[PDB]
């Protein structure tokens, strides 16, 4: 059902043309359905929403003090970006050096939900593993969710291999997002500590 624990969840949305405008709406929906099943609060589950192409568009920050309802709305209002490339390396790097530059909330697990539907050019993957290892060194769990037949499988397998908690969810389409939404929310919640 619902998650009331200490967690810092970062939604990373593939912003490539690999996802149609309509498909990206399904993705954004799943993200909002998720926020609905999380206890969004600075004392419980904090959320950040970022859409990624060549760069990152941060719509919600973990420190953003806005009513959950407001945050779910902002999420639903995430502009579609049909870029030819959505750099996973760049988002993890951005997640690493920007989002988790400092760990202000050690009492919370950190999960980077990497919703991916594309595959960046190899030259962009050069430091891929190094970024995933850097995240691991801040204890930021990286959960990869493959969507569609273009989601970088190599990188998905590679992320699972970097750390034991990095579990992957490989879906055939944004339509499976809803069917698995609950198992995904459960897993992420179970990687978080309840609070006393």
């Amino acid at each position, epitope marked *: 059902m619902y998650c009331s624990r200490l967690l810092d969840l970062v939604f990373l949305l593939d912003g490539s043309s690999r996802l149609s405008e309509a498909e990206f709406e399904v993705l954004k929906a799943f993200v909002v359905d998720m926020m609905e099943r999380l206890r969004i609060s600075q004392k419980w589950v904090r959320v950040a929403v970022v859409e990624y192409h060549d760069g990152s568009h941060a719509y919600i920050g973990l420190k953003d003090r806005k009513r959950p309802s407001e945050l779910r709305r902002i999420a639903s209002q995430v502009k579609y970006a049909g870029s030819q490339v959505a750099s996973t390396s760049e988002v993890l790097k951005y997640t690493l050096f920007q989002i988790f530059s400092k760990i202000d909330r050690p009492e919370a697990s950190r999960i980077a939900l990497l919703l991916m539907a594309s595959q960046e*050019p*190899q030259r962009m993957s050069r*430091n891929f*593993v190094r970024y995933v290892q850097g995240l691991k060194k801040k204890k930021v769990i990286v959960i990869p969710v493959g969507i569609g037949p273009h989601a970088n499988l190599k990188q998905i397998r590679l992320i699972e291999k970097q750390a034991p908690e990095n579990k992957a969810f490989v879906l055939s389409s944004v339509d499976e997002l809803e069917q698995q939404r609950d198992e995904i929310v459960s897993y992420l919640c179970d990687l978080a500590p309840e609070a006393p």
Partner: antibody
Amino acid sequence: QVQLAESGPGLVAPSQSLSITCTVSGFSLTDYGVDWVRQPPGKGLEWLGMIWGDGSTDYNSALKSRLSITKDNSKSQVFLKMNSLQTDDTARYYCVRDPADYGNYDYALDYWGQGTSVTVSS
Amino acid sequence: DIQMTQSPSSLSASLGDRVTISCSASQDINKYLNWYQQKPDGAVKLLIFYTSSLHSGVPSRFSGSGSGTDYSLTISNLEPEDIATYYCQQYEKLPWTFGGGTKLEVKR
């Protein structure tokens, strides 16, 4: 087995361009990358750029975007193209294989070619 | 550009000698260092990669070590065919940069 052979112009007038084809053998260009390294006379080695198995490339910013590396997987050939060559671009140019395996962060220049000398003067 | 420094450019040794070539980096390069050999006839070959792994067919007299900013290549017993120039190269950050090189010279 693994081989790499250069075929260059030998000579190049200033302002002109250098075109070198690297004929590789003993491996598939979809599996490995290919780098270009040059050595100015009486000087050390210099890394120019490379082209991954998928075709993406990486260039040495110092070349002021004068370099282009493309290839033809079927013809096991990688083409280097450099614009506006100056005298100080005179050097022996080698095409070198490299794993281009970001999975293992493995980019060693494991197998080099004999190289080709390039003299740039009027 | 990470600057790779190989202090001695010329290194006199005697066959049988144990030789050590040093390479230092302008910054921490997390053991992302390779060692290359260019024989007098111009041939270049990779000897050691990732600081200490020997490349296929490379004799065990060659060994590499180091971490952080200081690395080195060692030839346990110098063989004649080992007379050549040695270059270290970092792959910590693009573009890849080589050291100035160290040419082995025979003592007489």
